[PDB]
């Protein structure tokens, strides 16, 4: 098919125009869409195809050159994942890392640099290994030459020694559409779609999950983000940590297993499906079941094949600097306390039971599927709202 290809996760500081840059690269000018959007995570995907036009060469996102008026050719399809806040952003890089192939970082001209939250979310791209950046130097309509050579220098300063060292520095205007084919090139030469092996054993991370019908059958609908191998109509697949039960009082989890019915993906119902971007799995599975995201935070694989099921968990921890209301200095982990994991898609609070050097164990309220090796993000109650804090590997 001709679904998104990669993810490209838009960063930067509240207000420097990572939401209005999605809409102009989207062509979003008008509704909502919100309704597809994590529960677990606040992430949100937009897909936009890039196009060239074979007259004067440059890109865009219209089938319609905005340049010349020409009809533009094909060139890959890509998805923007844009969250609401600071904190759901850092969560989510630090959750899933699989989720993203490349980033765009936004940084306002008009601003002093750098900016507490920027520093934070380049710290998370430099811990998750992500290198694949391009850097948008916005509302560069609002400064004259002299602030906007003086700011590109600050950004030069700011990116050296970091994951984002390489990346190209774009001066753009995400409100008027300025130099925007500039920075659609970038993403094709600087945000390749990855050499994926299509025959790794499927994953897909649950985001959401349905009972499609209407008031007044088909199965259950899971939509999430394929991370490994793909996905095709007809496949048996395996749900972790699966349907809820009771036994002698007390809760536990079954694997359930059903079958691939449809697979939708960049706006149509497809054979096969990969990673990038957001792919709806109609399955066999009693609307029951997976209706109001009862199956969100599971993840998806053939049978035999998925990784393993945590009651609990040993993690080797990375406490966070954090420098966004003073109470910067992060407290030690002390044993007894509750803590919210995000690890994929997946959200569970956990009660430390141990502590190691640079290590605790952790009781689960709900299990989870992971691999050993995998990031979970820590966050601690702050007062009565849940902050990012850290993170941890799981072990074995
Ligand atoms: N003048 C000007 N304003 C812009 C530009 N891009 C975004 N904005 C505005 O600045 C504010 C913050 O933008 P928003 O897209 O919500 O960015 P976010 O907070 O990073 O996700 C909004 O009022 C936008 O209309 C730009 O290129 N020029
Ligand atoms: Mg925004
Ligand atoms: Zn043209």
């Known amino acids: 098919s001709r679904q998104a290809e990669v993810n490209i996760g838009m960063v930067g500081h509240v207000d420097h125009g990572k939401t209005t840059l999605t809409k102009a690269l989207t062509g979003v000018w008008t509704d909502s869409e919100e309704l597809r959007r994590g529960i677990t995570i606040k992430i949100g995907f937009a897909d936009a195809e890039i196009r060239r036009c074979p007259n004067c060469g440059r890109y865009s996102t219209s089938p319609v050159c905005p340049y010349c008026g020409h009809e533009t050719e094909f060139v890959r399809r890509v998805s923007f994942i844009d969250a609401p806040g600071h904190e759901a952003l850092m969560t989510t890089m630090l959750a899933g890392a699989s989720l993203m192939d490349g980033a765009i970082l936004v940084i306002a001209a008009n601003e002093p640099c750098p900016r507490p939250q920027t520093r934070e979310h380049l710290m998370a791209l430099q811990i998750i290994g992500q290198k694949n950046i391009i850097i948008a130097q916005n509302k560069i309509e609002l400064?004259?030459?002299?602030?906007?050579?003086?700011?590109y220098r600050q950004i030069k300063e700011f990116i050296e020694?970091?994951?984002?060292?390489?990346?190209?520095?774009?001066?753009?205007?995400?409100?008027?559409?300025?130099?925007?084919?500039?920075?659609?090139?970038?993403?094709?030469?600087?945000?390749?779609?990855?050499?994926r092996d299509p025959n790794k054993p499927p994953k897909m991370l649950v985001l959401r999950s349905f009972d499609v019908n209407k008031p007044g059958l088909v199965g259950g609908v899971l939509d999430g983000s394929i991370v490994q191998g793909k996905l095709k109509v007809g496949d048996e697949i395996e749900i972790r940590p699966g349907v809820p039960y009771e036994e002698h009082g007390r809760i536990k989890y079954e694997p359930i297993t059903t079958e691939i019915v449809s697979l939708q993906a960049g706006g149509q119902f497809v054979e096969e499906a990969y990673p990038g971007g957001l792919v709806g799995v109609g399955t066999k599975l009693d609307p029951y079941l997976t209706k109001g995201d009862l199956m969100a935070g599971n993840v998806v694989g053939k049978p035999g094949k998925l990784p393993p099921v945590w009651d609990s968990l040993r993690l080797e921890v990375h406490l966070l600097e954090r420098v966004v209301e003073q109470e910067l200095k992060v407290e030690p982990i002390k044993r007894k306390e509750v803590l919210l994991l995000n690890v994929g898609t997946a959200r569970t609070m956990g009660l430390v039971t141990g502590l190691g050097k640079d290590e605790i164990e952790v009781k689960?309220?709900?299990?989870?599927?992971?691999?050993?090796?995998?990031?979970?993000?820590?966050?601690?109650?702050?007062?009565?709202?849940?902050?990012?804090?850290?993170?941890?590997?799981?072990?074995?």
Do not use: M
């Open 364 to 396: 689960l309220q709900i299990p989870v599927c992971a691999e050993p090796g995998d990031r979970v993000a820590i966050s601690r109650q702050i007062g009565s709202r849940w902050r990012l804090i850290g993170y941890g590997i799981i072990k074995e």
């Open 161 to 195: 020694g970091t994951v984002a060292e390489n990346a190209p520095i774009i001066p753009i205007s995400a409100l008027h559409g300025a130099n925007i084919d500039v920075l659609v090139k970038a993403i094709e030469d600087f945000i390749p779609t990855p050499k």
């Open 143 to 151: 400064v004259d030459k002299e602030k906007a050579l003086e700011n």
